[PDB]
Amino acid sequence: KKEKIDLFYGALLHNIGKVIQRATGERKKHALVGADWFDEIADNQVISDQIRYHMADHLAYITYIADNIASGYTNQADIFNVFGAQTDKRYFKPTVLNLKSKPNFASATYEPFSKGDYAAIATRIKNELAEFEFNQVQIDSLLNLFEATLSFVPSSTNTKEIADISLADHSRLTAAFALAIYDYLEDKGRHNYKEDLFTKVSAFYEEEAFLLASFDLSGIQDFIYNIAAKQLKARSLYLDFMSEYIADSLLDKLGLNRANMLYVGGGHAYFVLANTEKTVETLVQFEKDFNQFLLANFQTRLYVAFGWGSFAAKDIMSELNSPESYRQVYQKASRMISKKKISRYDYQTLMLLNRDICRGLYQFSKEIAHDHFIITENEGLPIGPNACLKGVAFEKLSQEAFSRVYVKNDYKAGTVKATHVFVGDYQCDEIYNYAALSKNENGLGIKRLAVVRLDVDDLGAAFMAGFSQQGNGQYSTLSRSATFSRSMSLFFKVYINQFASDKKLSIIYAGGDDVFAIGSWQDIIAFTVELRENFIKWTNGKLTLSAGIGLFADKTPISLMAHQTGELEEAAKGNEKDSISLFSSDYTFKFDRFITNVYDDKLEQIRYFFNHQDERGKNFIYKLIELLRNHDRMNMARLAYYLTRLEELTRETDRDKFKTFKNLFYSWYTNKNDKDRKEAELALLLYIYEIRKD
Amino acid sequence: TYKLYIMTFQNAHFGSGTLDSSKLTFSADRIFSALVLEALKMGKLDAFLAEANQDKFTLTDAFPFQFGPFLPKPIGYPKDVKEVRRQAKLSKKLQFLALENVDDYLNGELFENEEHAVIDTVTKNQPHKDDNLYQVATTRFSNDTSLYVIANESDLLNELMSSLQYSGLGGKRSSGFGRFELDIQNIPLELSDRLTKNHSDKVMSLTTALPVDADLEEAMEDGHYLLTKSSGFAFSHATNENYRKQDLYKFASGSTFSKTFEGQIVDVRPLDFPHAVLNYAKPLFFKL
Amino acid sequence: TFAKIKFSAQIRLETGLHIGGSDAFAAIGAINSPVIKDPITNLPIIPGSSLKGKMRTLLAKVYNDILSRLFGNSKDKRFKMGRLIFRDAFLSNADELDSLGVRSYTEVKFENTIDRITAEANPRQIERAIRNSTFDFELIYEITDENENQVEEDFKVIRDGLKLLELDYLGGSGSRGYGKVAFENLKATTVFGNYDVKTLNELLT
Amino acid sequence: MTFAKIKFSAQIRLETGLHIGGSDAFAAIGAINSPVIKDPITNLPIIPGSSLKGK
Ligand SMILES: Nc1ncnc2c1ncn2[C@@H]1O[C@H](COP(=O)(O)OP(=O)(O)OP(=O)(O)O)[C@@H](O)[C@H]1O
Ligand SMILES: Nc1ncnc2c1ncn2[C@@H]1O[C@H](COP(=O)(O)OP(=O)(O)OP(=O)(O)O)[C@@H](O)[C@H]1O
Ligand SMILES: [Mg+2]
Ligand SMILES: [Mg+2]
């Protein structure tokens, strides 16, 4: 594993020139100035030899072929340009990841900033790259240094055809390939000179090498919610570090790492392994090793189905009609999982069967304020066939294997083994006190908790069969899908936490497409309005989500909470799939229509009336709701009398103010589309909720 | 193998693990443990156990009869950008197929579980205990849905099965759950030719089975099966308490194997327990 | 000796009853306590557990064995699921309530609460099945060889448990009405088995 | 045998005829603005037990 170290860093660093190039812009080539800047730090030769001569030593031809398998002056283009929409640029503001700042929502007014602010990027690179030991111990701490800084800078960025993918992911997905090229060429048994297969000939694409593995932590939903209530947060976070330890021990039994990975969010996780005579039976062995671990603990409530797809390098490009077979790359591993999800638990795992952690995980619930998670051995909370999992304090260095630090990337990014799991910030209060904290300082608002359960609609559809509208030799690259899968994973696992700034709620599992938030009812809806409105800016709204909110009292069980809002977003997955559903199986408004026509159009004007008058009140509101629920044709006329009778009763310094209310109220009551009526039936509910005294 | 046993249920409760979930059907354990409890309330217990151990005895799981007999989804037979993904969320709540459509299903036709019941839950309590606030789930059939345990017809079996209809079937009996009425009907021939017990080519089991130890290896590598969980307590009249059973895993109905096998009736007696608590896992099959 | 005798009484509500329902989301201008109704038949029912627990406690106030063998007991080795299988009632006169003009079979009663010392009311909309609704009641007493001359001791208890429930409420907010109930047309056929009918049908009234 | 249950029969023959309020719905356009509580099957005035208990 000595040559695998030096082949890996130089694959990540073969385009470290273009961040040293475009900051303090020279004129010469970028592949040379990368190693020129690199030789001043630690003076390592073999890594620098991979940087000197990879664009024109039997080590840099692996980088030259894998730079092509990544994708085969101008700011970074947006990943949501190549879809069913053809008028946007939305170039990225090239700043760094911050974790305590607002997301750089990419607008079309960021084309010129291609030279200036890159010096703020390259300054931070000197901090962590200098004191760097280049072993496999700090093997992921450099992967922090690209995702936190090199993210929003572009790659080649010339007048080429790719123009879209990043430099962080292009460093990862090339270095993901280059180790898998090594294991495919080593397990084949020939090392007699790379140029002969890679540069002398180009027929390396025409064989099924570097297969795509995957797994699926099934039973992940029914484990958590079938349980004075914040113990569920640690239960949903325990299955993330289990979901990462599966993804890390599978790469410990191989010679790979977090570069050789495309997704880990919530049970599902994709990979790029090496299609060898070795990796196919270390998957069967690790699947057999881990599923018997789940039997002795969780007794087939959980199951992991390792499926793999043996694809070829030709089926990843854009030149041929490989996008018509690009879904088949994921499908071959998805057909194996869906077949392994059926035929589970082979013979002697069942013949042996036909003949604690329940208390131990309570100790992990008090370890949630800690931020450093350790892979210990036979101590507490087992997560693997000989390992355990504990949340230790700052008093670390007690027999660690992985130091699973918190979501920082910046604060704890100075220690050893920076392994990162991005989960669930802003657990503000305990769950039984979100109802009682709905009254303001004035003391009005209704004492009810409310719980958001949302997901993004066609995320698996747009991941696989996305980028597929522009020609027959269309774009549809794995790199265009890895950066898509990075963009959603960087949205949910990071940016939700700043959307929950001080919104009086507790995010539980901002994971894959799912978000399960639970908090006070006023700011659980203010969260959801500031969730998708930030998301449609983030996605150039063409790929939508759907929420379901359920208003409950205090001390209702969470299994009743999470199901009755779980089967209340199912009513929002059937409206048009782009819809909120509030508190019940009706009120299923389209989400874009919910904000511009209920939450800000009507509810402000209902708030603007009763907070700028004196003589009306809740009695007038309640008889408007009762005439809005029934709606006969008789109640159109009966409401025309009721609103005109109250002009006569006002004090004539408010009559024209009320006349602008009733000419606007009776406008949306009498229609044919039946649309604005139930909107104002809902807009009166949220107004009369927020004004109720004890 | 003989005649259908249509049962008009009208507000039953068939729990699966918990009390908060009824499951709209019942395994062959639920009907076999019922008959033995009927045969023990009568005197005719050992007359049934000799017939239960008999080679010709057949049962199957319950499947929704409303107009014609329905069958479980053959697990592992699907043998284009969003609908192939959209229908996977819809052909996963698809489990009960019409007998006039199984041959159409294996060649491709969409179905949606034409609705049989509203599987709701009710909230109940005991007023002077301060901690009894429970919920019983409920399957409530759509006024013409029946279930038909297919069984070998006998004078003893009709004597006991017509005693279940005035004694309930399933969970929360003595509270108004599981009480039904029988309609023994002749099996149609387009279903009757596919019923097998020792076939050898591409068969589908339609009851919860558990093979003999030699045969159990044979069903693994070629079977598109699905597991279950036969836990719970043992209902007895000679214990003074309640003990757990021995928690075996059976292959759920719809387990399409490559060929048939022979399964036993698994004895799940607790440790130091007076009588024998059984579990019917004899299989019954269906060609394609 | 094996038989299964079945009661078929007619539950008549001299005062309209409430059986609570289940915790669902009530809106602003909606009913705060909807009655439990079968989802398919949008009609009221009386659940068999609601008839059991009221009859269990009322006979416990008299017969305090005799009570455990009629209702079951998880303890008391031989008295698990003892001898009675109740059934959820259903509306019999759904066609006979209309023509005595009733547009919906459940009335909605409006109530409030006068908080003491502030005198500010606190309203409430609870839903109740209307009075001359007649529910069909089926109580099933199963005969096995383990009875041994107890098939008349167990009918000065059931017919007295009905009589106690005549003059007590049946479900929901009793002591404010809502349970003045009547059992009508008592008879005990033998739907399965071989047992007489005259020795217990003449015990009536 | 110290369990009994007795009943006070009475006759509420009133004066100054009473208004136990019922459906506070949105009434008709010139009709009764506040009706009383009634039996459904006969539309006769009732005095509910809850109005007798809290009072
Ligand atoms: N750690 C976690 N905490 C909470 N929810 C999670 C977690 N991981 C995954 N989930 C969510 O739970 C959802 C339900 O997954 P489920 O339990 O159905 O497994 P599954 O693999 O989706 O099974 P199937 O593929 O058969 O539907 C997933 O869509 C996922 O978004
Ligand atoms: N971080 C991720 N990267 C790539 N794909 C993801 C990611 N998270 C979730 N997905 C996709 O989203 C899916 C979540 O499934 P889920 O059932 O919650 O909704 P869905 O399949 O997207 O469609 P629908 O919302 O209509 O049910 C996963 O199957 C996965 O394919
Ligand atoms: Mg989702
Ligand atoms: Mg989705």
JSON list of C-alpha atoms in Angstrom, two decimals, chain A residues 234-309:
[
{"chain": "A", "resi": 234, "resn": "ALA", "atom": "CA", "xyz": [-29.96, 10.06, 19.25]},
{"chain": "A", "resi": 235, "resn": "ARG", "atom": "CA", "xyz": [-31.72, 7.06, 17.69]},
{"chain": "A", "resi": 236, "resn": "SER", "atom": "CA", "xyz": [-31.91, 8.78, 14.29]},
{"chain": "A", "resi": 237, "resn": "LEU", "atom": "CA", "xyz": [-28.30, 9.93, 14.67]},
{"chain": "A", "resi": 238, "resn": "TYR", "atom": "CA", "xyz": [-27.06, 6.48, 15.70]},
{"chain": "A", "resi": 239, "resn": "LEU", "atom": "CA", "xyz": [-28.11, 5.17, 12.30]},
{"chain": "A", "resi": 240, "resn": "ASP", "atom": "CA", "xyz": [-26.06, 7.81, 10.51]},
{"chain": "A", "resi": 241, "resn": "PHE", "atom": "CA", "xyz": [-22.79, 6.76, 12.12]},
{"chain": "A", "resi": 242, "resn": "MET", "atom": "CA", "xyz": [-23.85, 3.20, 11.40]},
{"chain": "A", "resi": 243, "resn": "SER", "atom": "CA", "xyz": [-24.55, 4.31, 7.83]},
{"chain": "A", "resi": 244, "resn": "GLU", "atom": "CA", "xyz": [-21.04, 5.76, 7.66]},
{"chain": "A", "resi": 245, "resn": "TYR", "atom": "CA", "xyz": [-19.25, 2.91, 9.42]},
{"chain": "A", "resi": 246, "resn": "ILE", "atom": "CA", "xyz": [-20.65, 0.56, 6.79]},
{"chain": "A", "resi": 247, "resn": "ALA", "atom": "CA", "xyz": [-19.32, 2.96, 4.18]},
{"chain": "A", "resi": 248, "resn": "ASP", "atom": "CA", "xyz": [-15.95, 3.20, 5.94]},
{"chain": "A", "resi": 249, "resn": "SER", "atom": "CA", "xyz": [-15.31, -0.42, 6.93]},
{"chain": "A", "resi": 250, "resn": "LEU", "atom": "CA", "xyz": [-16.11, -1.45, 3.37]},
{"chain": "A", "resi": 251, "resn": "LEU", "atom": "CA", "xyz": [-13.31, 0.91, 2.37]},
{"chain": "A", "resi": 252, "resn": "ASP", "atom": "CA", "xyz": [-11.10, -0.39, 5.18]},
{"chain": "A", "resi": 253, "resn": "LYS", "atom": "CA", "xyz": [-11.36, -3.94, 3.85]},
{"chain": "A", "resi": 254, "resn": "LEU", "atom": "CA", "xyz": [-10.27, -2.40, 0.55]},
{"chain": "A", "resi": 255, "resn": "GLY", "atom": "CA", "xyz": [-7.54, 0.13, -0.03]},
{"chain": "A", "resi": 256, "resn": "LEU", "atom": "CA", "xyz": [-9.97, 2.95, -0.73]},
{"chain": "A", "resi": 257, "resn": "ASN", "atom": "CA", "xyz": [-11.42, 5.93, 1.13]},
{"chain": "A", "resi": 258, "resn": "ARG", "atom": "CA", "xyz": [-14.05, 8.69, 1.05]},
{"chain": "A", "resi": 259, "resn": "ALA", "atom": "CA", "xyz": [-12.90, 9.74, -2.41]},
{"chain": "A", "resi": 260, "resn": "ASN", "atom": "CA", "xyz": [-14.11, 6.34, -3.67]},
{"chain": "A", "resi": 261, "resn": "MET", "atom": "CA", "xyz": [-17.68, 7.35, -2.83]},
{"chain": "A", "resi": 262, "resn": "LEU", "atom": "CA", "xyz": [-20.46, 9.32, -4.49]},
{"chain": "A", "resi": 263, "resn": "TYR", "atom": "CA", "xyz": [-23.20, 9.42, -1.82]},
{"chain": "A", "resi": 264, "resn": "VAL", "atom": "CA", "xyz": [-23.79, 8.30, 1.78]},
{"chain": "A", "resi": 265, "resn": "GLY", "atom": "CA", "xyz": [-26.98, 10.11, 2.71]},
{"chain": "A", "resi": 266, "resn": "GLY", "atom": "CA", "xyz": [-29.34, 8.06, 4.83]},
{"chain": "A", "resi": 267, "resn": "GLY", "atom": "CA", "xyz": [-28.88, 4.34, 4.39]},
{"chain": "A", "resi": 268, "resn": "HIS", "atom": "CA", "xyz": [-28.31, 4.38, 0.64]},
{"chain": "A", "resi": 269, "resn": "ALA", "atom": "CA", "xyz": [-24.71, 4.87, -0.42]},
{"chain": "A", "resi": 270, "resn": "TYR", "atom": "CA", "xyz": [-23.04, 4.53, -3.81]},
{"chain": "A", "resi": 271, "resn": "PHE", "atom": "CA", "xyz": [-19.41, 3.77, -4.57]},
{"chain": "A", "resi": 272, "resn": "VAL", "atom": "CA", "xyz": [-16.85, 3.26, -7.30]},
{"chain": "A", "resi": 273, "resn": "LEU", "atom": "CA", "xyz": [-14.87, 0.11, -6.47]},
{"chain": "A", "resi": 274, "resn": "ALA", "atom": "CA", "xyz": [-12.54, -1.86, -8.76]},
{"chain": "A", "resi": 275, "resn": "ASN", "atom": "CA", "xyz": [-14.02, -4.66, -10.89]},
{"chain": "A", "resi": 276, "resn": "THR", "atom": "CA", "xyz": [-11.52, -7.30, -9.87]},
{"chain": "A", "resi": 277, "resn": "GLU", "atom": "CA", "xyz": [-11.33, -10.97, -9.01]},
{"chain": "A", "resi": 278, "resn": "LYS", "atom": "CA", "xyz": [-10.85, -9.69, -5.43]},
{"chain": "A", "resi": 279, "resn": "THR", "atom": "CA", "xyz": [-13.46, -7.03, -4.72]},
{"chain": "A", "resi": 280, "resn": "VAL", "atom": "CA", "xyz": [-16.44, -9.18, -5.65]},
{"chain": "A", "resi": 281, "resn": "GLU", "atom": "CA", "xyz": [-15.81, -11.70, -2.87]},
{"chain": "A", "resi": 282, "resn": "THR", "atom": "CA", "xyz": [-14.80, -9.19, -0.22]},
{"chain": "A", "resi": 283, "resn": "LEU", "atom": "CA", "xyz": [-18.29, -7.74, -0.72]},
{"chain": "A", "resi": 284, "resn": "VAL", "atom": "CA", "xyz": [-20.00, -11.10, -0.22]},
{"chain": "A", "resi": 285, "resn": "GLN", "atom": "CA", "xyz": [-17.82, -11.66, 2.84]},
{"chain": "A", "resi": 286, "resn": "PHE", "atom": "CA", "xyz": [-18.52, -8.24, 4.34]},
{"chain": "A", "resi": 287, "resn": "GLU", "atom": "CA", "xyz": [-22.24, -8.58, 3.60]},
{"chain": "A", "resi": 288, "resn": "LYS", "atom": "CA", "xyz": [-22.19, -11.96, 5.36]},
{"chain": "A", "resi": 289, "resn": "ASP", "atom": "CA", "xyz": [-20.12, -10.46, 8.19]},
{"chain": "A", "resi": 290, "resn": "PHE", "atom": "CA", "xyz": [-22.39, -7.48, 8.76]},
{"chain": "A", "resi": 291, "resn": "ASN", "atom": "CA", "xyz": [-25.81, -9.12, 8.42]},
{"chain": "A", "resi": 292, "resn": "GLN", "atom": "CA", "xyz": [-25.04, -11.61, 11.17]},
{"chain": "A", "resi": 293, "resn": "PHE", "atom": "CA", "xyz": [-24.08, -8.60, 13.27]},
{"chain": "A", "resi": 294, "resn": "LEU", "atom": "CA", "xyz": [-27.58, -7.21, 12.78]},
{"chain": "A", "resi": 295, "resn": "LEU", "atom": "CA", "xyz": [-29.18, -10.50, 13.81]},
{"chain": "A", "resi": 296, "resn": "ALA", "atom": "CA", "xyz": [-27.45, -10.71, 17.20]},
{"chain": "A", "resi": 297, "resn": "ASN", "atom": "CA", "xyz": [-28.50, -7.12, 17.98]},
{"chain": "A", "resi": 298, "resn": "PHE", "atom": "CA", "xyz": [-31.46, -5.92, 15.95]},
{"chain": "A", "resi": 299, "resn": "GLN", "atom": "CA", "xyz": [-33.02, -9.34, 15.01]},
{"chain": "A", "resi": 300, "resn": "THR", "atom": "CA", "xyz": [-33.87, -8.65, 11.32]},
{"chain": "A", "resi": 301, "resn": "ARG", "atom": "CA", "xyz": [-35.30, -5.21, 11.94]},
{"chain": "A", "resi": 302, "resn": "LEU", "atom": "CA", "xyz": [-32.34, -3.99, 9.87]},
{"chain": "A", "resi": 303, "resn": "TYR", "atom": "CA", "xyz": [-30.64, -5.43, 6.79]},
{"chain": "A", "resi": 304, "resn": "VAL", "atom": "CA", "xyz": [-27.88, -4.26, 4.45]},
{"chain": "A", "resi": 305, "resn": "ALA", "atom": "CA", "xyz": [-28.07, -5.34, 0.80]},
{"chain": "A", "resi": 306, "resn": "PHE", "atom": "CA", "xyz": [-24.74, -4.88, -0.98]},
{"chain": "A", "resi": 307, "resn": "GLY", "atom": "CA", "xyz": [-25.47, -4.80, -4.69]},
{"chain": "A", "resi": 308, "resn": "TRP", "atom": "CA", "xyz": [-22.82, -4.09, -7.30]},
{"chain": "A", "resi": 309, "resn": "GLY", "atom": "CA", "xyz": [-22.88, -3.18, -10.97]}
]
